[PDB]
Every structure is written in C-alpha cells, then in structure tokens.
Amino acid sequence: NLCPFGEVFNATRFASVYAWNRKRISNCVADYSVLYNSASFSTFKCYGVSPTKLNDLCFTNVYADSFVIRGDEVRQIAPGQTGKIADYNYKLPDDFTGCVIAWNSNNLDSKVGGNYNYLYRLFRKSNLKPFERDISTEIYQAGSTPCNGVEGFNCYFPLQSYGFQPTNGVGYQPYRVVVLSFELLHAPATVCGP
Amino acid sequence: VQLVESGGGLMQAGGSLRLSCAVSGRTFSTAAMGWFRQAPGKEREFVAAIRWSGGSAYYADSVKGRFTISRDKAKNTVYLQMNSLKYEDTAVYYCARTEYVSYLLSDYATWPYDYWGQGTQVTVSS
Ligand SMILES: *[C@@H]1O[C@H](CO)[C@@H](O)[C@H](O)[C@H]1NC(C)=O
C-alpha cells in the first residue's frame, strides 16, 4: 500500500508557484529511502527530522506541495526567509519541521525562444501567512487612485511570467520544488514507514 | 496552434468593419492577443492589445476613440471593431498571440509575439 510520492515527484507538469499544488498523503506506507538515496536532487533539507527517523514514525497526514521557481529563489523556500516568493507566493512557517527538495528542471521547463507558462505573483497588499495560497488576478493599486479592475498608470496585473530559456544562467533556470509537511492530529496516524 | 483571421475587406471612409481572429489547436495558456497592420511599403505597426485575463486593452495613439479590441474566451477569439474608417487605415491587418504575462499592459505594444495570423486586407475608399 505504497504512498503515491511518484505522482508528485514525477508529475509531467508542475504548478506555477502562485498556484502551488498540494497532495494529501494518507493511509499508506511511505518509502522515504527512494527520496533520501536519490542522486536526482540538488536540495534536500529537513528541519528537525531526518528521513531516516521518518521510517519509524507515523503521521495522520503528509502534505507534498509542488511548484516551479528559478534557481536563485530556492533559498526562499525555508523558514524565516523574505523576497517575492516567500512574501507573495509560497510561505513556510518560522517553526517548519518538514523537508524541502528541489532539482533543476531546465530539460522539461525551458524551451528555445522562452517558456513563459510559469508565473509568479509580483504584487500583493500584504505578505502571505504560512501555507496561504493566492490565485486572484485583481488589478493591483500601486498608487492612491483606485483601478476598478482596469490596468493603466499605477494599476498593474499582479502576475508575471518567468522567462525560461535553456541558455539562461543556472540562477535563472527552472527548479521543481517539493515541500513535505508531517502532521500528527488526535486522529489515527496512518502514514508509516516500512 | 493556428490564428485564423476573417472579416475586413472594402468599406467607404466613415464606415465600420469588424475583424475576427480565432485561435485553434491545443494551447496551455494565452496571456494576450493583439492586432498589427502593414500598409504597402511601410513597416508593420502596433494597433491594439488585450489581456486574456480581465480584458484590459492598450491602443496605438492613431486608433484611440475609433477602434475597440475585445475577446470571447469561450470562443478563443479576439475582435477589432474598426469605426470611423480613414484612408490611413488601409493595410493588411495581422492578429498575434503570446503566452508571455507582463505585469505592465503597455509592454504588449512592443513585445515580440510568438504566433501570427495570415493577414486580412482592409481597404478604405472615398
Ligand atoms: C520517479 O521515477 C523514477 C523512474 O523514472 C524512479 O526511479 C523514482 O524513484 C520515481 N520517484 C518516486 C518518488 O517514486
């Protein structure tokens, strides 16, 4: 009864970071070894928990959050970070105790002439709370004049394309990210290691 | 992916024509559509753009108050309503499509678009 981590890590298409996807994992055996033994990953940071000790703990739910950002933004997927991604797109809590996993996806997510299909939120009235998701396309009021849903001076569309060309510097190449969160509730702990 | 234009043709000055541009084939996303025109022996020039999301429009100074760009998302079609036609409006009109999302609508006036239609003749007579 294997946890379906394959569906997340090996998905053909990933979400834009503003529209990040969550998979709820429950009622299954989690083989964390397949992840922590892999040569596929450039980032594999776990905060106060080791994939090794996960193999003898049970959780009520595990969440796998997945999306694309550029290489130099992977550092923002960590507790206590700021920047466009942490502030407006995907926010970890200060007390995060899960894992952040990332790999270069230049082969899949870039194309000659530019892949523009991956977006991020460039403007927002306030910072996201941890694990908050905002997919609104409200015209953003940068000035004192209301926009009334009409773009113009100081009235902007809040989303912006990444420009992923395969010749980009590695800092500007696409990275696929999976964030694992481990949840223990009053209810039965049914996600266990082997 | 194909952009299929229709409408336009011959109309006397002061009259109104509507151009259509239908997008066919599998698309992942559409950021914006635009109309451009090329008069014989002149460079192709921007006419109008519309953001697919929200429908905000951006116009060349030469067509403000005369032309309206609009789009039907369900029909994947963009339209140019060409009112108060002048001899200067005589040109081949091209629709264009991009998946590039800029926060800044005015960027669609100068952005190099990814996909182009075959072009549709508009001729304004006396
Ligand atoms: C993803 O697929 C590869 C085979 O292409 C496999 O080796 C890897 O373990 C898979 N990932 C997961 C988490 O199942």
CB of A5 within 6 A of ligand 1: the answer is: yes
* Phi and psi, residue A115, nearest 5°: -90, 120
**Ligand 1: which residue has its CA nearest to atom 5?**
A10
Our CA-based measurement puts residue A159 at a distance from the nearest CA of chain B, in whole angstroms, of 6
The method of structure determination was X-ray
- Ligand 1 atom with the smallest distance to the CA of A35 is 13
For chain A, the domains span: 1-113+166-194, 114-165
Which residues touch A7 (CB under 8 Å, ≥6 apart)? A23
Ligand 1 atom nearest A9 alpha carbon: 13
Reduced to 3 states, what is the DSSP secondary structure of residue B100?
A: coil
In angstroms, the CA A177 to CA A170 distance is 15
Q: Which amino acid is located at A48 in the chain?
A: G
Residue A32 Cβ inside 6 Å of ligand 1? The answer reads no
- For B8, the domain range is 2-125
For residue B27, the distance in angstroms to the closest alpha carbon of chain A comes to 10
User: How far apart are the C-alpha atoms of B50 and B73, rounded to whole Å?
Assistant: 12
User: What Å resolution does this PDB entry report?
Assistant: 1.6
From CA A46, how far away is CA A78, in angstroms rounded?
10
d(CA B82, CA B91): 12
Q: What is the CATH number of the domain that holds B54?
A: 2.60.40.10
Residue whose Cα lies nearest atom 11 of ligand 1: it is A6
Provide the domain count of chain B: 1
HEC string for A135-174:
CCCCCEECCCCCCCCCCECCEECCEEECCECCCCCHHHCE
The 3 state secondary structure assigned to chain A is CECCHHHHHCCCCCCEHHHCEEEEECCEECCCHHHHCCCCCCEEEECCCCHHHHCCCEECEEEEEEEEEEHHHHHHCCCCCCCHHHHHCCCCCCCCCCEEEEEECHHHHCCCCCECCCEEECCCCCCCCCCCCCCCCCCEECCCCCCCCCCECCEECCEEECCECCCCCHHHCEEEEEEEEEECCCCCCCEECC
**What distances in angstroms separate CA B80 from CA A31, A159, B25, B39, one per listed residue?**
57, 26, 22, 17
Partnered with residue B11 across adjacent β-strands are B124
Q: Which residue type, as a one-letter code, is found at position A114?
A: G
CB atoms within 10 A of CB A191: 22
Evaluated on CA atoms A70, A72, A77, A81, the torsion sign reads negative
- Which residues are paired to B94 by β-bridges? B36
- Contact present, A2 and A29 (Cβ < 8 Å): yes
